[PDB]
Structure 1
Amino acid sequence: IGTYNEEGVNVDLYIPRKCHATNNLITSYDHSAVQIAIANVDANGVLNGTTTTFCIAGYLRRQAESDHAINHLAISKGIIRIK
């Protein structure tokens, strides 16, 4: 990940986050891009401490693509189950 030399030494200041909805990038001047955390659960119905995470981005939220995103991600993990 990121730019290298021919010595393999990484020269990027930092490597930014993805959007997992649309595979974009999450800029420092965008304040509308967020991170949600859904706690994983064992048998009996208790918490084991969080695993799964989503990332959504600026572009989506103001066009109201939000809900549609979070469905189409959660279904892929098996968090949400379609009847």
Structure 2
Amino acid sequence: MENDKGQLVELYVPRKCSATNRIIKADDHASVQINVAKVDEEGRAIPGEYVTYALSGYVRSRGESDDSLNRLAQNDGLLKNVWSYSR
């Protein structure tokens, strides 16, 4: 959203569930945003650096999330198995 001359004219841009590209509308509570993590090449938790992702309320209600992430950090680049795009 913007003017004639490149002036972002808004309150903000809404944040949008990360697997579901709906919206997160202010006063959700249900509302999470994850901060997993990465290892460094060693049993050491990497600090000040992490992943992210972002759950609606939407799906907390429906069982969903557990299987929605178990798509995504396997789908990203950390996890191996559990999950299948071919059930």
Q: Which has the higher contact order (CA 8 A, sep 6+)?
A: 2
* Most deviating of 41-50 and 57-66: 41-50
Please state how far the C-alpha of 1:52 moved relative to its aligned partner. Answer: 1.0
Kindly indicate whether the alpha-carbon contact (under 8 Å) linking 1:19 and 1:57 is maintained by their aligned counterparts in 2: yes
TM-score (norm 2): 0.82
C-alpha separation between the residues in 2 aligned to 1:11 and 1:82? 45
Give the 3-state SS of the residue equivalent to 1:53 in structure 2. coil
Looking at secondary structure, tell me which structure has more strand per residue: 1
Over aligned residues, Cα RMSD in angstroms? 1.5
Task: Report the number of matched residues.
Answer: 81
TM-score by length of 1: 0.85
Structure 1 segments of 4+ aligned residues over 4 angstroms from their partners: none
Alignment of 1:12-31 (within 5 A): 12-31=10-29
Whether the 8 Å contact between 1:32 and 1:58 is mirrored in structure 2 is yes
1:36 partner SS: coil
In the alignment, structure 2 segments of 5+ residues that lack a partner are 83-87
Q: As a proportion of its length, which structure holds more helix?
A: 1
- What runs of 5+ residues in structure 1 fail to find an aligned partner? none
- C-alpha separation between the residues in 1 aligned to 2:37 and 2:61? 27
Match of 1:69 in 2: 68
Q: Per the alignment, in what secondary structure is the counterpart of residue 12 of structure 1?
A: coil
Shift of 1:63: 1.1
CA offset at residue 11 of structure 1?
A: 0.5
Instruction: Kindly report which structure 2 residues correspond to 1:48-67, keeping only aligned pairs within 5 A, or say none.
Output: 48-49=46-47, 50-67=49-66
Deviation at 1:45, TM superposition (A): 2.7
Q: Among all aligned residue pairs of Structure 1 and Structure 2, give the percentage whose two residues are the same amino acid.
A: 41
